[PDB]
Design a protein around this nucleic acid. Structure first.
Lengths: 100, 100, 126, 80, 153, 205
RNA sequence: UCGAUGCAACGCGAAGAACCUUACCUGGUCUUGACAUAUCUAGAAUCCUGCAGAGAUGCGGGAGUGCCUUCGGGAAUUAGAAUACAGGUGCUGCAUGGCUGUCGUCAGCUCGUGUCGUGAGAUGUUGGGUUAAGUCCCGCAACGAGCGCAACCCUUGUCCUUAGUUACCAGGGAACUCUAAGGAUACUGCCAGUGACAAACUGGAGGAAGGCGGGGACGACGUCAAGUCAUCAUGGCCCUUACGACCAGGGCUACACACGUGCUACAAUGGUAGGUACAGAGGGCAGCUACACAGCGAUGUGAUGCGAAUCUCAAAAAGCCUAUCGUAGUCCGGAUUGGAGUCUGCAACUCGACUCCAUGAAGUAGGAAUCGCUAGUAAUCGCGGAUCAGAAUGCCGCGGUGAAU
């Protein structure tokens, strides 16, 4: 029953609060929770030519970070699971449930 | 690119989608070692007899908006020009100017 | 059990100082076996020897990352960090030697259009 | 070249033209555009007219030309 | 540069003699950033000359040969109203050492012995008595300085 | 052509992306293409109501489109009958319900896109470019912008030789990364060609 | 095929031409057309087929009868009936927008008010210092402001805090490294001097860092009628059974030649054969593959783990120890050619990449001339990624060793 929540987003200041309220709502229901471990973010870089035709020497360097966090509920409770299933967080952050 | 070439890519991908499953089953048949030698030979003969555009090799990745074959990015699906336009406008989530 | 953490361009080392005979064991192996470089061996054993105490402290080093000389620099930095722990009078001498400063030098990134960090392609007037 | 496990490659449309030529034992030059088909000893003796981009140049197949592709004897570029 | 005089870098001494002079010569022998290869070349040369001459401490011998190779007067180009004058001037000691080390390496690079370490040891021995292409280059520079010896601007 | 996009260079320091979703490397391309399709459809359809900040954020299939316009009444319609049609048209060419919730711009003279599109409409109505430019400067400055710059580029007044003209008032410090500079670039299709309109509105820190 | 043509065209568009791409040539074809709206005739679309043909295409046979409203019928759908038209990588970058190069990350470029001059204009913005800087101070008919400089952003350098898995291992631990968020520090802050009683500079302490700590992004008003009408958009001009459209083959890969960027070398600071170490970053279901077996090898078969800090690419190479080669066009160099294969792919002839065996070309350091680099730099060594079915010596990054001046 040791559930594991996995958060994956592009915005690093979104997962921080997403995990903060998850750990707060899982620790305010009389349960013990370990803090959100941050896993190595993946940075993908792109080299986009800026000129429409020529002079390859001019280009923009873009990047996209994929930040990932993980929380574990070492001992769960019914008053934790019911409050967790209502915590419908979306729009920017992907949440995956281990369920066990 | 030319509207004709965009429609040509579309009709080239239509056949790929139409014969996607047939190619997979036939490929398993021809690579089956337990299958008879004449059986796999005939299956490969049929594979070479399939219509030409049905192959996913004749497919050329093009920008969704402009149809440009050169300067394509898989993750974004657009050519470098309009990729840069949308990133700089801010329409592309996560992606920003990089420096390190 | 004084503990020091040393860092170099990419290697990070953690050293454990404890009064003993003078044996140095790096990554569970002797220093000479670990380091085939005479220069690296000297660099590791230098902070011990500038103040005349090579065979006084037993050292347990664990290094990670970096290269053969980066790891030597990291061990030197960690040994300095541990030496300043037991006695603060050795700190002025360590500073005068320049071992307490962490070398911030890193590999300069390759820039766009340049063949390297600073190397540019050949230029022709015509 | 190719893989031996895959087997010899011959286009079906030209293979049909030679199964309708070696039973008949005709000497009509079979006019073809598929230069990507390997000459097998099955039609050794007869004549094909392989397209070299501009014209259908004639290639009478011989005994020591099997294993080659039909295009090897139909050059496309003209040096001088 | 054009504005300031940079603070020079510190050079750590050689591991087997503890001398920054031998370390700097190892740097001058170095190529492609191979300290180990340069160090074994120089150490092979030094042990060869030491075992041949029966000298216990060869750092003093290296100092002797270095001071013997070092020039004192170098010719510098000066401009006075469109005239290029080859004025002889003194050599600052750092440039003295650099020129001596560079001349020793470039002379040892062109000899006929089998190994480069053997070549370097033979060149050290030769400049010890006062012969070899390093000595010829030093004599050439002194020759030009004395050949001018007429501009004290 | 030597200046960085004011929005793009500020995309992470003080501004925010006007697209907030997450995808997987394979799904991301189709999400982005659908997003761009929706954006172009919206900008062609609601060309009467002065929308400026359509934002696309799609939580798990269902999306929450947020258009910000200076005239919400016309685009919503009577009792809300145009908005329902827009809802279903969005849903048709996306996956599942696209809840379009519509904001209101309480200062249309501080949004760069509204200013730029107003100048563009005036230019296509054969209005003097100098007067339209100066009117926009005055309107923004007296509406309370800490700075406005507007650049008009092209065959201005039917001139054979295209030229670039501009007016600045206030500060608009482009190089300051924390400057809160809205920026817009539109085009007016006149009878002699395209005239580009650029507007920088600097609002604070 | 087309474009790019002094710096600032020439491994440039092109981040990857067997077909496709493709825009070019040869041939075979179509004409509201491959694509949008106006329309009315039948049908749910859709699936499986036969033959002829290189294919585009042409001629035929079976199954299915949608869904909501229901006898007007509708979101889609196949073949035309015709006019609008569509389509054009056709031309004009000297009609244009957007985008980019470049002087140049150079420190400049202006404006309002005031004043001076008949005026164009000037002043400010000049001068004494000072600075990386029109940076700052002081003077000063100027007083102020704006865009530029700097700062705010990212990364790296030390520490603290929250957290401890798939990460770590000092004694299950919550120490440490690490990971990734939030902060601390650095301010000429203190000392001594020089300096107009200044700005500032010089040296010193403390500190991981000292003066802009290192690297990046950020590119003023403008200049080249600079580049791009072939990303796109667009004014005008031009073609509409054709300069539009579809298919097969070929070409873009030809070479008396010349030049521009590179890679590999000409060896002993090295080649080869054995052992023995030390990374970072990035990729992985459009896949990476543990392990076992077969093969000289590329690879093939079975099988396992992993959407990954878990499993994998993957072994880092240069380095170190031993042996050998002993200066030879060689045990250097590895082009070219002959043979036999493996993969990817409908298909490797034109025209793929690797593997194996054989061959072994020039090349012994390069004329006039000319280029990059000031420190973790140059030099050298490997390793990843984009594009990508396959196809980097290019491009974009990563770390290792590591100078001289």
């Amino acid at each position: 029953q040791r559930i594991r929540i996995r958060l994956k987003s592009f915005d690093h200041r979104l997962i921080d609060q997403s995990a903060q309220e998850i750990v707060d709502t899982a620790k305010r229901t009389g349960a013990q929770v370990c803090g959100p471990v941050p896993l190595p973010t993946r940075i993908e870089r792109f080299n986009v030519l800026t000129s429409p035709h020529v002079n390859k020497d001019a280009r923009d360097q873009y990047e996209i970070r994929t930040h990932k966090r993980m929380v574990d509920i070492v001992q769960p409770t019914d008053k934790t699971v019911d409050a967790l299933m209502k915590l419908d967080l979306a729009a920017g952050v992907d949440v995956q449930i281990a369920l066990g | 690119a030319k509207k004709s070439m965009i429609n040509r890519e579309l009709k080239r991908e239509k056949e790929v989608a139409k014969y996607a499953d047939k190619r997979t089953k036939l490929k398993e048949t021809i690579s089956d070692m337990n299958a008879s030698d004449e059986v796999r030979m005939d299956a490969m003969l049929e594979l070479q007899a399939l219509p030409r555009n049905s192959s996913p090799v004749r497919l050329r990745n093009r920008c969704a908006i402009t149809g440009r074959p050169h300067g394509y990015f898989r993750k974004f699906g657009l050519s470098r020009n309009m990729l840069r336009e949308r990133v700089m406008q801010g329409d592309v989530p996560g992606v920003r100017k990089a420096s390190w | 059990r004084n503990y020091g953490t040393g860092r170099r361009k990419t290697s990070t080392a953690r050293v454990f100082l404890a009064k003993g005979t003078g044996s140095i064991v790096v990554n569970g192996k002797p220093l000479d076996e670990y380091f085939s470089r005479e220069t690296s061996r000297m660099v590791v054993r230098q902070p011990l020897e500038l103040l005349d105490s090579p065979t006084a402290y037993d050292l347990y080093i664990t290094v990670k990352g970096g290269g053969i000389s980066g790891q030597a620099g990291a061990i030197r930095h960690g040994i300095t960090r541990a030496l300043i722990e037991l006695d603060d009078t050795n700190k002025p001498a360590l500073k005068a030697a320049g071992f307490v400063t962490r070398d911030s030098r890193q590999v300069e990134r390759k820039k766009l259009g340049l063949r390297k960090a600073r190397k540019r392609p050949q230029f022709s007037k015509r | 070249p190719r893989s031996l496990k895959k087997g010899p490659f011959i286009d079906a449309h030209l293979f049909a033209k030679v199964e309708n030529a070696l039973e008949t034992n005709s000497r009509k030059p079979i006019k073809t555009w598929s230069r990507r088909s390997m000459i097998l000893p099955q039609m050794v003796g007869l004549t094909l007219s392989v397209h070299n981009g501009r014209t259908h140049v004639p290639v009478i197949v011989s005994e020591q030309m099997v294993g080659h592709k039909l295009g090897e004897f139909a050059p496309t570029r003209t040096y001088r | 540069p054009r504005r300031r005089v940079v603070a020079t870098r510190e050079i750590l001494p050689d591991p087997k003699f503890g001398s920054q002079t031998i370390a700097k010569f190892i740097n001058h022998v170095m190529s492609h950033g191979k300290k180990s290869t340069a160090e074994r070349i120089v150490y092979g040369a030094l042990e060869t000359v030491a075992q041949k001459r029966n000298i216990e401490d060869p750092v003093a011998f290296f100092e002797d040969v270095l001071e013997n190779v070092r020039p004192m007067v170098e010719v510098k180009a000066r401009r006075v109203g469109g005239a290029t004058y080859q004025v002889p001037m003194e050599v600052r000691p750092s440039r003295r050492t650099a020129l001596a080390m560079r001349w020793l390496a470039e002379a040892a690079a062109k000899r006929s012995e089998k190994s480069m370490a053997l070549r370097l040891a033979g060149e050290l021995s030769d400049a010890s008595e006062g012969k070899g292409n390093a000595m010829k280059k030093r004599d050439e520079v002194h020759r030009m300085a004395d050949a001018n010896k007429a501009f004290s601007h | 052509g030597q200046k960085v996009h004011p929005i793009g260079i500020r995309l992470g320091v003080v501004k925010k992306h006007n697209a907030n979703w997450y995808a997987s490397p394979k799904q991301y391309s189709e999400y982005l293409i659908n997003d761009i399709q929706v954006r172009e459809y919206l900008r062609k359809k609601l060309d009467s109501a002065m929308i400026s900040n359509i934002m696309i954020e799609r939580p798990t299939g269902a999306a929450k489109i947020t258009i910000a316009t200076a005239r919400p009444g016309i685009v919503i319609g009577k009792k809300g009958e145009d908005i329902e049609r827009l809802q279903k048209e969005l849903t048709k060419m996306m996956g599942v319900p696209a809840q379009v919730n519509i904001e209101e711009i309480t200062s249309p003279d501080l949004d760069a896109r509204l200013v730029a599109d107003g100048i563009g409409s005036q230019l296509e109505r054969r209005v003097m470019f100098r007067r339209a430019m100066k009117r926009a400067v005055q309107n923004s400055m007296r509406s309370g912008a800490k700075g406005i710059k507007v650049e008009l580029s092209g065959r201005l007044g039917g001139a054979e030789i295209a030229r670039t003209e501009w007016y600045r008032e206030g500060r608009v410090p482009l190089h300051t990364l924390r400057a809160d500079i809205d920026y817009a670039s539109v085009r007016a299709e006149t009878t002699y060609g395209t005239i580009g309109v650029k507007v920088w509105i600097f609002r604070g820190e």
